Amino acid sequence: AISKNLPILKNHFRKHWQERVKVHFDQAGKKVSRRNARATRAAKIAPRPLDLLRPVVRAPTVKYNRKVRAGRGFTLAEVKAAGLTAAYARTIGIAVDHRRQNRNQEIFDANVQRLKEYQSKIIVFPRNGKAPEAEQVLSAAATFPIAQPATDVEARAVQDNGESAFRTLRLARSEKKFRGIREKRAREKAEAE
Protein backbone atom coordinates (compact mmCIF):
# COMPACT_ATOMS: atom_id res chain seq x y z
CA ALA A 1 0.00 0.00 0.00
CA ILE A 2 2.91 2.30 -0.74
CA SER A 3 4.21 2.58 -4.26
CA LYS A 4 5.23 4.88 -7.13
CA ASN A 5 6.44 8.43 -6.78
CA LEU A 6 3.21 9.92 -5.54
CA PRO A 7 2.41 12.39 -2.89
CA ILE A 8 1.50 11.18 0.55
CA LEU A 9 -2.25 11.69 0.93
CA LYS A 10 -4.42 12.19 3.97
CA ASN A 11 -8.01 11.21 3.30
CA HIS A 12 -9.67 10.86 6.68
CA PHE A 13 -12.30 8.24 5.71
CA ARG A 14 -11.92 5.71 8.48
CA LYS A 15 -15.06 6.39 10.46
CA HIS A 16 -18.55 5.51 9.23
CA TRP A 17 -18.41 8.70 7.25
CA GLN A 18 -21.17 7.81 4.86
CA GLU A 19 -23.57 8.49 7.71
CA ARG A 20 -22.74 12.16 7.70
CA VAL A 21 -22.74 13.20 4.10
CA LYS A 22 -24.53 16.51 3.57
CA VAL A 23 -25.31 17.14 -0.10
CA HIS A 24 -26.80 20.58 -0.60
CA PHE A 25 -29.50 19.52 -3.05
CA ASP A 26 -31.61 22.09 -1.26
CA GLN A 27 -29.40 24.91 -2.47
CA ALA A 28 -31.88 26.37 -4.93
CA GLY A 29 -34.70 25.66 -2.53
CA LYS A 30 -33.24 27.44 0.48
CA LYS A 31 -32.41 30.50 -1.65
CA VAL A 32 -35.95 30.80 -2.76
CA SER A 33 -37.13 30.39 0.81
CA ARG A 34 -34.52 32.80 2.05
CA ARG A 35 -35.93 35.30 -0.48
CA ASN A 36 -39.54 34.84 0.41
CA ALA A 37 -38.70 35.35 4.10
CA ARG A 38 -37.26 38.72 3.20
CA ALA A 39 -40.31 39.62 1.19
CA THR A 40 -42.49 38.73 4.16
CA ARG A 41 -40.36 40.60 6.59
CA ALA A 42 -40.19 43.80 4.57
CA ALA A 43 -43.96 43.63 4.08
CA LYS A 44 -44.66 42.98 7.78
CA ILE A 45 -41.97 45.46 8.91
CA ALA A 46 -44.10 48.28 7.51
CA PRO A 47 -41.98 51.09 6.00
CA ARG A 48 -38.91 50.20 8.08
CA PRO A 49 -35.81 48.95 6.30
CA LEU A 50 -34.71 45.34 6.64
CA ASP A 51 -31.51 46.17 8.67
CA LEU A 52 -30.13 48.53 11.38
CA LEU A 53 -27.50 51.25 11.26
CA ARG A 54 -24.11 49.77 11.96
CA PRO A 55 -20.95 51.74 12.93
CA VAL A 56 -17.58 51.97 11.23
CA VAL A 57 -14.89 50.15 13.08
CA ARG A 58 -11.22 49.50 12.40
CA ALA A 59 -10.68 45.72 12.04
CA PRO A 60 -8.53 43.85 14.48
CA THR A 61 -5.07 42.21 14.16
CA VAL A 62 -2.03 42.98 12.04
CA LYS A 63 -3.46 41.45 8.92
CA TYR A 64 -6.69 43.36 8.59
CA ASN A 65 -6.32 46.71 10.35
CA ARG A 66 -5.63 48.45 7.02
CA LYS A 67 -9.30 48.04 6.31
CA VAL A 68 -12.36 49.30 8.04
CA ARG A 69 -15.58 47.37 8.33
CA ALA A 70 -19.05 47.54 9.78
CA GLY A 71 -19.19 47.16 13.52
CA ARG A 72 -21.92 45.77 15.70
CA GLY A 73 -23.43 48.81 17.37
CA PHE A 74 -22.60 52.43 18.15
CA THR A 75 -21.25 52.65 21.80
CA LEU A 76 -22.89 54.64 24.55
CA ALA A 77 -20.32 57.39 23.99
CA GLU A 78 -21.07 57.77 20.28
CA VAL A 79 -24.86 57.79 20.81
CA LYS A 80 -24.55 60.49 23.51
CA ALA A 81 -22.39 62.60 21.28
CA ALA A 82 -24.79 62.29 18.39
CA GLY A 83 -27.52 63.73 20.55
CA LEU A 84 -29.73 60.83 21.53
CA THR A 85 -29.99 58.25 24.30
CA ALA A 86 -29.51 54.52 23.88
CA ALA A 87 -33.06 53.38 24.51
CA TYR A 88 -34.47 55.67 21.86
CA ALA A 89 -31.72 55.03 19.33
CA ARG A 90 -32.78 51.39 19.56
CA THR A 91 -36.33 52.17 18.49
CA ILE A 92 -35.20 54.32 15.53
CA GLY A 93 -33.37 51.46 13.84
CA ILE A 94 -29.93 52.32 15.14
CA ALA A 95 -27.83 49.52 16.63
CA VAL A 96 -26.15 50.29 19.96
CA ASP A 97 -23.42 48.25 21.69
CA HIS A 98 -22.68 48.60 25.42
CA ARG A 99 -19.47 46.49 24.84
CA ARG A 100 -17.45 48.60 22.37
CA GLN A 101 -15.13 51.37 23.42
CA ASN A 102 -13.67 54.55 22.09
CA ARG A 103 -9.92 55.08 21.96
CA ASN A 104 -9.50 56.34 18.36
CA GLN A 105 -11.01 59.78 17.81
CA GLU A 106 -10.99 59.55 14.03
CA ILE A 107 -13.32 56.58 14.20
CA PHE A 108 -15.32 58.11 17.05
CA ASP A 109 -16.01 61.17 14.94
CA ALA A 110 -16.68 59.00 11.91
CA ASN A 111 -19.48 57.27 13.76
CA VAL A 112 -20.93 60.38 15.35
CA GLN A 113 -21.19 61.84 11.85
CA ARG A 114 -22.55 58.58 10.57
CA LEU A 115 -25.37 59.12 13.08
CA LYS A 116 -25.95 62.70 12.16
CA GLU A 117 -26.34 61.71 8.50
CA TYR A 118 -28.82 58.98 9.44
CA GLN A 119 -31.01 61.13 11.59
CA SER A 120 -31.32 63.75 8.89
CA LYS A 121 -32.03 61.11 6.29
CA ILE A 122 -34.73 59.24 8.15
CA ILE A 123 -38.28 60.19 9.10
CA VAL A 124 -40.01 59.07 12.26
CA PHE A 125 -43.74 58.80 12.05
CA PRO A 126 -45.76 59.90 15.11
CA ARG A 127 -47.03 57.49 17.74
CA ASN A 128 -50.66 58.61 17.14
CA GLY A 129 -50.91 55.82 14.48
CA LYS A 130 -52.12 58.30 11.78
CA ALA A 131 -49.56 56.71 9.40
CA PRO A 132 -48.65 59.10 6.51
CA GLU A 133 -47.59 56.12 4.34
CA ALA A 134 -44.24 56.81 2.76
CA GLU A 135 -42.18 54.27 0.93
CA GLN A 136 -39.88 51.54 2.02
CA VAL A 137 -36.20 51.87 1.39
CA LEU A 138 -34.81 48.47 2.11
CA SER A 139 -31.18 48.77 3.14
CA ALA A 140 -29.77 51.13 5.73
CA ALA A 141 -26.42 49.71 4.76
CA ALA A 142 -26.82 50.48 1.01
CA THR A 143 -27.88 54.00 1.84
CA PHE A 144 -25.01 54.70 4.14
CA PRO A 145 -22.04 52.80 2.71
CA ILE A 146 -18.85 52.39 4.68
CA ALA A 147 -15.86 53.60 2.71
CA GLN A 148 -12.15 53.30 3.40
CA PRO A 149 -10.63 56.59 4.67
CA ALA A 150 -8.12 58.40 2.40
CA THR A 151 -4.71 58.26 4.02
CA ASP A 152 -2.59 60.71 1.93
CA VAL A 153 -2.55 62.65 -1.33
CA GLU A 154 -1.48 61.19 -4.60
CA ALA A 155 1.81 62.89 -5.20
CA ARG A 156 3.82 65.09 -2.94
CA ALA A 157 7.39 66.26 -2.49
CA VAL A 158 10.23 63.82 -1.70
CA GLN A 159 11.67 64.48 1.75
CA ASP A 160 14.74 62.32 2.51
CA ASN A 161 16.08 63.25 5.94
CA GLY A 162 19.06 60.96 5.47
CA GLU A 163 18.68 58.06 7.91
CA SER A 164 17.60 54.89 6.03
CA ALA A 165 14.33 52.98 6.60
CA PHE A 166 15.97 49.61 6.77
CA ARG A 167 18.44 50.54 9.37
CA THR A 168 15.76 52.20 11.50
CA LEU A 169 14.01 48.83 11.58
CA ARG A 170 17.09 46.87 12.54
CA LEU A 171 17.88 49.44 15.17
CA ALA A 172 14.29 49.39 16.42
CA ARG A 173 14.29 45.59 16.60
CA SER A 174 17.53 45.75 18.52
CA GLU A 175 16.58 48.28 21.15
CA LYS A 176 13.66 46.08 22.09
CA LYS A 177 15.64 42.89 22.19
CA PHE A 178 18.30 44.08 24.54
CA ARG A 179 15.88 46.21 26.50
CA GLY A 180 15.82 43.87 29.47
CA ILE A 181 19.53 43.16 29.61
CA ARG A 182 20.48 46.84 29.70
CA GLU A 183 17.96 47.33 32.46
CA LYS A 184 19.72 44.61 34.43
CA ARG A 185 23.04 46.25 33.68
CA ALA A 186 21.69 49.50 35.10
CA ARG A 187 19.99 47.88 38.09
CA GLU A 188 23.19 45.99 39.06
CA LYS A 189 25.41 49.02 38.37
CA ALA A 190 23.36 50.83 41.03
CA GLU A 191 24.25 48.19 43.65
CA ALA A 192 27.77 49.45 43.16
CA GLU A 193 27.52 50.48 46.85
Binding site: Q101, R103, N104, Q105
Partner: protein, 99 residues
Protein backbone atom coordinates in the same frame (compact mmCIF):
# COMPACT_ATOMS: atom_id res chain seq x y z
CA UNK B 1 1.34 55.07 25.35
CA UNK B 2 2.04 56.78 22.07
CA UNK B 3 2.98 54.36 19.33
CA UNK B 4 6.18 54.92 17.36
CA UNK B 5 4.36 54.64 14.07
CA UNK B 6 6.55 51.93 12.61
CA UNK B 7 5.93 48.20 12.39
CA UNK B 8 8.48 46.72 14.82
CA UNK B 9 10.08 47.82 17.96
CA UNK B 10 9.24 49.07 21.37
CA UNK B 11 6.07 51.07 21.02
CA UNK B 12 5.16 49.37 17.79
CA UNK B 13 2.14 50.59 15.75
CA UNK B 14 -0.02 53.31 14.24
CA UNK B 15 -0.27 56.76 15.79
CA UNK B 16 -3.92 57.58 16.28
CA UNK B 17 -5.34 60.68 18.02
CA UNK B 18 -6.19 58.98 21.28
CA UNK B 19 -9.17 59.14 23.66
CA UNK B 20 -9.36 56.98 26.86
CA UNK B 21 -13.02 55.94 27.49
CA UNK B 22 -15.32 56.59 30.44
CA UNK B 23 -14.58 53.92 32.96
CA UNK B 24 -16.69 50.76 33.37
CA UNK B 25 -18.00 49.95 36.88
CA UNK B 26 -17.72 46.27 36.03
CA UNK B 27 -14.02 47.11 36.31
CA UNK B 28 -14.66 47.57 40.00
CA UNK B 29 -16.27 44.26 40.87
CA UNK B 30 -13.57 43.70 43.50
CA UNK B 31 -13.86 46.90 45.50
CA UNK B 32 -14.67 46.81 49.25
CA UNK B 33 -17.63 48.88 50.46
CA UNK B 34 -18.32 50.13 53.91
CA UNK B 35 -21.24 47.69 54.15
CA UNK B 36 -19.11 44.68 53.33
CA UNK B 37 -16.18 45.84 55.40
CA UNK B 38 -18.44 46.13 58.47
CA UNK B 39 -20.26 42.83 58.02
CA UNK B 40 -17.08 40.90 57.47
CA UNK B 41 -15.34 42.48 60.41
CA UNK B 42 -18.39 41.55 62.49
CA UNK B 43 -18.65 38.01 61.38
CA UNK B 44 -14.98 37.57 62.21
CA UNK B 45 -15.30 38.44 65.86
CA UNK B 46 -18.39 36.30 66.02
CA UNK B 47 -17.06 33.08 64.51
CA UNK B 48 -13.43 33.52 65.53
CA UNK B 49 -10.53 31.80 63.85
CA UNK B 50 -10.57 28.32 62.27
CA UNK B 51 -8.17 25.38 62.89
CA UNK B 52 -5.76 26.17 60.13
CA UNK B 53 -5.80 29.88 60.99
CA UNK B 54 -4.98 29.19 64.66
CA UNK B 55 -2.04 26.96 63.69
CA UNK B 56 -0.98 29.66 61.31
CA UNK B 57 -0.38 32.43 63.81
CA UNK B 58 1.42 30.02 66.18
CA UNK B 59 3.65 29.17 63.33
CA UNK B 60 4.15 32.90 62.85
CA UNK B 61 4.67 33.54 66.54
CA UNK B 62 6.92 30.53 67.02
CA UNK B 63 8.76 29.86 63.74
CA UNK B 64 8.87 32.97 61.52
CA UNK B 65 6.94 34.31 58.56
CA UNK B 66 8.55 32.34 55.74
CA UNK B 67 7.63 28.93 57.18
CA UNK B 68 4.20 30.36 57.82
CA UNK B 69 3.82 30.96 54.08
CA UNK B 70 5.17 27.53 53.19
CA UNK B 71 2.48 25.83 55.22
CA UNK B 72 -0.22 28.25 54.14
CA UNK B 73 0.59 27.67 50.48
CA UNK B 74 -0.12 23.96 50.89
CA UNK B 75 -3.24 24.70 52.87
CA UNK B 76 -4.86 27.21 50.57
CA UNK B 77 -4.50 27.21 46.87
CA UNK B 78 -1.19 28.79 46.25
CA UNK B 79 1.62 31.15 47.12
CA UNK B 80 -0.21 34.32 46.31
CA UNK B 81 -3.17 33.60 48.65
CA UNK B 82 -0.72 32.29 51.24
CA UNK B 83 1.06 35.57 50.99
CA UNK B 84 -2.20 37.29 51.52
CA UNK B 85 -3.27 35.00 54.33
CA UNK B 86 -0.19 35.30 56.49
CA UNK B 87 -0.59 39.09 56.06
CA UNK B 88 -4.14 38.97 57.44
CA UNK B 89 -2.91 36.89 60.40
CA UNK B 90 -0.05 39.27 60.90
CA UNK B 91 -2.62 42.04 61.32
CA UNK B 92 -4.77 39.99 63.69
CA UNK B 93 -1.77 39.73 65.96
CA UNK B 94 -0.73 43.36 65.85
CA UNK B 95 -4.26 44.71 66.21
CA UNK B 96 -5.16 42.28 68.97
CA UNK B 97 -2.53 41.04 71.34
CA UNK B 98 -0.31 44.15 70.84
CA UNK B 99 -1.75 47.65 70.29
Amino acid sequence: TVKTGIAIGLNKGKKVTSMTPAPKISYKKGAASNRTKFVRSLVREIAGLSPYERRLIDLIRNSGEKRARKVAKKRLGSFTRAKAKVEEMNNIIAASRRH
